Automatic annotation (TrEMBL), chain A:
<feature type="binding site">
    <location>
        <position position="113"/>
    </location>
    <ligand>
        <name>Fe(3+)</name>
    </ligand>
</feature>
<feature type="binding site">
    <location>
        <position position="67"/>
    </location>
    <ligand>
        <name>Fe cation</name>
    </ligand>
</feature>
<feature type="binding site">
    <location>
        <position position="48"/>
    </location>
    <ligand>
        <name>Mg(2+) 2</name>
    </ligand>
</feature>
<dbReference type="GO" id="GO:0016702">
    <property type="term" value="F:oxidoreductase activity, acting on single donors with incorporation of molecular oxygen, incorporation of two atoms of oxygen"/>
</dbReference>
<feature type="binding site">
    <location>
        <position position="69"/>
    </location>
    <ligand>
        <name>Fe(3+)</name>
    </ligand>
</feature>
<feature type="binding site">
    <location>
        <position position="46"/>
    </location>
    <ligand>
        <name>Mg(2+) 1</name>
    </ligand>
</feature>
<feature type="binding site">
    <location>
        <position position="1"/>
    </location>
    <ligand>
        <name>Mg(2+) 2</name>
    </ligand>
</feature>
<feature type="binding site">
    <location>
        <position position="113"/>
    </location>
    <ligand>
        <name>Fe cation</name>
    </ligand>
</feature>
<keyword id="KW-0408">Iron</keyword>
<feature type="binding site">
    <location>
        <position position="113"/>
    </location>
    <ligand>
        <name>Mn(2+)</name>
    </ligand>
</feature>
<keyword id="KW-0223">Dioxygenase</keyword>
<feature type="binding site">
    <location>
        <position position="69"/>
    </location>
    <ligand>
        <name>Fe cation</name>
    </ligand>
</feature>
<protein>
    <recommendedName>
        <fullName>Cysteine dioxygenase</fullName>
    </recommendedName>
</protein>
<keyword id="KW-0479">Metal-binding</keyword>
<dbReference type="GO" id="GO:0008198">
    <property type="term" value="F:ferrous iron binding"/>
</dbReference>
<feature type="binding site">
    <location>
        <position position="20"/>
    </location>
    <ligand>
        <name>Mg(2+) 3</name>
    </ligand>
</feature>
<feature type="binding site">
    <location>
        <position position="100"/>
    </location>
    <ligand>
        <name>Mg(2+) 4</name>
    </ligand>
</feature>
């Protein structure tokens, strides 16, 4: 797969990584695929003890839900289209940012977010270090009470 | 009238809008002249702009409006302010477009005489903050 360092990458290095990958379509163009039904297409470009890299192809309906990445830092580069990056606020008036093609962002391991509102056919590259082996998925009950499900991923 | 969702538009939708309008010269060609409104309603303001080389917006924000710009002919310089005084400058050439969310601060300057561009804002541009420096060097924002 990818020829990356044998160590964890910090946020900035992860952002450099997804941006340089966007400039090397030889590493990912083959894997571009839009599942007509089923779940969010994801394609692993690289998974080892230190870094995970995925190529994501979005449908208009795709939604990560609210989640954290446990101990993983991460970065996202939008290659084509646009996404909405959302961050939760306790009041309920959550922060929403449009990330469009050519743009990228990164976060450390404390980040809680939701990606949704994609242009149909959008394409993005995501990288995580350490690997995204566990994620916390938040849900709300009828009461309004918030819980966090830790998911092996 | 423009067939648009009945709501404020985000920066991606505004970019799509200005590029779509650029591809339909039947709607704006008559209005080139060296600021013509193409459509204004509760959700969007869409403008055709013809630039002279001396034109300068000054540093400003759009309060709560997202925006997009398509350069139809010529070229513009888009500048974003930086702490330190070494502002970031980008030439936007004919065919090219960009958009921004409501937190944007920028300055647009004509880069070639006779440039023509299409801009769109949502929500409509009711207030703009124009930034200035006094003789202290202290920055202020006048809401216009
Ligand atoms: Mg209208
Ligand atoms: Mn995530
Ligand atoms: Mn402006």
């Amino acid at each position: 797969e990818l020829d990356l360092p044998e160590r964890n990458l910090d946020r900035r290095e992860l952002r450099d990584l997804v941006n340089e990958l966007a400039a090397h379509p030889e590493r990912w163009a083959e894997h571009v695929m839009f599942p007509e039904e089923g779940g969010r297409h994801y394609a692993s470009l690289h998974r080892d003890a230190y870094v995970d890299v995925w190529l994501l192809c979005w449908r208009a309906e795709d939604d990560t839900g609210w989640h954290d990445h446990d101990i993983s830092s991460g970065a996202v580069r939008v290659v084509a289209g646009a996404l909405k990056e959302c961050n939760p606020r306790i009041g309920g008036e959550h922060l929403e940012t449009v990330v469009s093609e050519g743009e990228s962002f990164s976060f450390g391991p404390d980040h809680i977010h939701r990606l949704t509102g994609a242009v149909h056919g959008s394409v993005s590259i995501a990288a995580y270090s350490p690997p995204l082996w566990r994620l916390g998925q938040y849900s709300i009950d009828d009461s309004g009470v918030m819980r966090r499900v830790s998911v092996s991923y």
